[PDB]
């Protein structure tokens, strides 16, 4: 599957991703970002659901996997001072 | 004696190409012309400089193009209006005139993707940057986003250079934000006084599943109609299917902005097969105002609100149709396209504009002048009827009252309007006039137009007339200028004019002749006419289904989209749910709204003629200056009078 | 639904064209329509309606519809039990399925409902989301509204304003609070006066005629009127087009004045008359202000200056008058002989400084003579008495930057009622003295003493012209034209507003200028 | 706190002392600007100090970029031309790494790939998408405030505000009559400073040649060299507390000078990518 953003957005991460033999998608996570937040867009890893559209300072996002799947990583991430989200990217 | 003339538009624009026409009457041999443009005042720098030679083989003509430079001399904002020192030298004779300059660089159109947004979403918006010819250009544009209180929240300074005149932008909505009508304002960096805006609403909502169209049987309401006002309620789903349920419909009156509701008119009708009928009776309406006279309701409007509820009780939709005016006559007469100046002894052409009470044009309506009844013109699809009356050679003001002779209707229900036309003041009472009459039909690109020149003068000086001079005004610029010959004895000559795509939406046509009769004085008589073209695209852009119809597609299915447009064109797209237009059908970008902005920025005010020869040019938006002393009046206002 | 596709094209040759809306209808035969509200309160039991539509022509459906379990909601669907019922839907009809839920946690939660039909391979599922807003009423409190102005409210140029934390003793347990801080600049609109109306200045277009001094009485109200009308932009209300008729009258008096120029590069009333110091210097004052309208030769203007420096300048800097002019009405305040050495030296020194930027290369003794003439005015400035001599010697010292100390205090306190420097005697000299001191107030860039001075010159309504009005028309419309060019529309806005919060480590600094004023700079903080 | 910062001093015959700065990139090379030196300046008259040491280190050669030409636009009326304003300083003595002297990492190397926790298959185009994206990028530079070094956090206008930043070069001295504004601003440039979105501190004349550093995950990566500015807000008395709004500063993008940097540092064990 391939990714392509709307007008006025910059695509970072792998634009072309491939499902491998280990049940995981290749490359990095595709993110469409406009560059309007203090932190960058944490994006949506494939299989997750992100709750939180504001990417300002002191904001938070929560992640949930699908049915029968186990979250690895941080369920909640928080934008810190300096432009770096707390925790780690889920999968 | 040789005569040298110069014609320039009324207002010149920054960074744009304007056209300049040079002539030399009663001359033989070549005349070298050196034209130099300076700023006002004092002549500090040369803004433009062009040269040409007037050959008698071209009948002493030569169109010259220049451009106001983008220099920082027009930097002061306290100056309000800007002027230039325009100067042309015909060999040894210098002719000059001060011309008004506007700071405007073009037009700016703002497209949004939706008309209403929730908190937490993101607003996508494009900005199209074009000049005065509706062609793309690269400038610096300042962009503002305002709250309902009118305070700008986010400011930017972008450039449309190397982007093909399309500026994609975005803005996120916070979760906690003020509801109401937000605003997006934008302007050019060189013209900050000319601001262009588009609104959008912010509301907490969910999308409905069906629309309700509230349309009455007529687009008005007659007072003495004993049947009342019948209103049809149409309710269908978004996907085309029809709606079963129940509706709640209530009428009301509106006087200005103070609304007075009518609780006596509450009805509950079932909606079967997506249709329903409801009637407001006249006895209920006359009992609500407590008015024994029925003639005082003329002027007020009526508004209907409907609320349809499904049989499952899962969704309901409120809809409203307002501005249904109560009138004695179903037609209105406006002389807004008709000239206010006539010529004695010559036929006068009236451009009658007939409207429905909601503003739409009327089809097939007889129009005859009261007190004459000779010509009974019928309305076209654009609502225009063509009349003509014979006039007496007198300088009395002409009071014309025009009525309608529509059948299936009495004379008390007919419309009327009276205007006053002032006589054209001649030069020296020589009674030399010139009339311009044109076949009024819907003009489309590709057709040819027959323009007629009628000359009324004495026979002692008609042999000196050998040529006419016509000029085309379109979108505040000069488009084409030429000559039209005349032999002695010909009272009428016809110019065939080809109609291209560049005359859209309308154009004005001026003409003049020049001669010396009796005493050695140069006489100039002129006339103008405004002709509307079919408001369509300059190019073309159609979007249809690339897949050969098939059936109605399934959610998740791929489809092919056929995009049909001009070559080398950047096409931008948007796909909107039609459940958005149920809540807000305002602020849609259409082609007809674009031509409404271009037509309201023209430098010509009066739709035809003037009080004298110099009043024709200033009311059509032109400047004239000659070597014999005849000029036009100054213009210090960027807008029209009143 | 139905999608309405709008398209806009952009060709470089054809231009713009917005397409007609093209409609694509998307529909299925069996589907669920999940109708959800915009927000539900946490722990409030609400009922949602899942409508199942059957658009088949003549086939009734037996459907088993089931609601999926979510831990964020409390319904009858659990982890070890399915909430599924089987219903029968007649053809060309719909059936509403009621479902009760209780949301358990704030945020954006998810609801999914699936269904499938009996003995056929048709199924559908809908997964939409709804906001779980926590319990309570949304409220806002204003913590502080403080007006920011350093130097006024502050000290030394800085202003410190401390903000206390909010109350929030009535807050809902386990809810988020957000504090918004707003910065807003206030626009100012100061200075500027109404210029003298051009309808009152019709009588100043005078054709000059006469001898060497009668030419200058006619040249003066025509040169100074074009200089005043070009800066105030009142050619529309004057009538326009008459500028060219007045530009030819300026070239008429320039030609007649050179006919009385002596071979010593000086000017007199006649060619057999001895050269004059005042008439040569007043020619320099008019000709240097007339370089913006027509052409001015370099060999006559600097030669008049070179005759004023090498021949008629003592090494003290004092300019002595050899032969005075015949018309004593054109000299103005110089007719009164009180301090002739301080008023005539100040009259020529303004003419040397208004021609300083013109004759710097030809006459190399001009930066020397300006230094020589400016030192004589500085010594005896503390001994002047008449209000005209203080005004004429204050503008000759301000163009170099030497009106400071005890000399600057004597210049401002001579004004009676702080609006006029009138002498006890001669109305024409008091009208001229207010305009000499106004030109010194605009060279110092002291805009505080200016608006009472300009308001007195406009309320007097002196429109120039007449006998003895040569200096009185030349100076009032020179100072009032200098006023309209040096007038600001606003005072400075430049606010170095830095915000230190104890929750962070960096200072949040904004600079609010005039163009970026009226623009809120929101900084949100969820910590109180 | 800033071990990589070099202080460069050039003594000229009665012209004065040129106080520039640089960045320690290896054991032998110090990266700085090119307009601090000319062809007439000899190596005995150029002294570089690092680590706060009182002594001056002696140099071997100053390597200019081959495209640098400051007077190459005097025909067009432009006195200055700061395109490709980078230079390397090869020292005479090897630098010993300790607690006060350490290098600064550079774009498109092996150590930069592990410092961002990227896979080793990361290309040089993938790293340019990481350090300089199309947004407003948080960065910092090093300045000298009263004989003491301090950091000034700025924002890199690389997104939609890149257009508003670059058009403010018309107000620079000598550039007041330049026709095309893109003639003096090549794509080898980055833009910092201004009022939107914040009030960034501006670079002084003494901070010229310094590094434009990006702090990400407690590590410091240099992405640019300080070149020139439109408005001189520093007068060696304080910082002029009323700056204008168009006071922008320009830098040299290190992603555009990579084939010259890879050639001159090929024997330095930096491990540039292919
Ligand atoms: C990611 O992978 C996609 C393919 O999966 C790459 O798309 C390739 O893009 C090129 C454009 O340089 C395509 O060439 C063009 O194809 C159109 C087809 O309509 C043809 O009309 C043009 O004349 C031109 O040949 C190419 O077809 C396309 N590849 C495929 C398989 O379709 C894309 O470049 C990759 N991007 C990255 C960042 O890796
Ligand atoms: C100013 O005058 C010049 C010269 O007369 C104009 O240039 C001419 O422009 C037309 C339009 O592109 C050229 O083609 C002509 O088109 C008409 C279309 O109906 C056709 O009937 C003619 O036979 C002709 O082919 C024409 O070749 C070109 N040059 C000359 C020497 O005529 C120019 O358009 C004028 N500009 C304005 C603003 O009036
Ligand atoms: C947060 O504080 C504001 C105080 O400013 C509370 O009142 C709200 O104030 C605004 C501004 O006056 C109102 O907007 C206006 O409403 C009027 C109708 O009364 C309309 O004509 C104007 O065009 C404008 O839109 C707003 O209605 C008002 N809110 C109300 C009355 O509910 C605000 O309520 C506070 N918010 C919360 C969540 O407590």
Numbering used by the authors:
A (entry chain F): 127 to 217
B (entry chain A): 23 to 664
C (entry chain B): 800 to 1327
D (entry chain F): 492 to 765
Paper quotes:
Structure determination of macromolecular complexes is challenging if subunits can dissociate during crystallization or preparation of electron microscopy grids. We present an approach where a labile complex is stabilized by linking subunits though introduction of a peptide tag in one subunit that is recognized by a nanobody tethered to a second subunit.
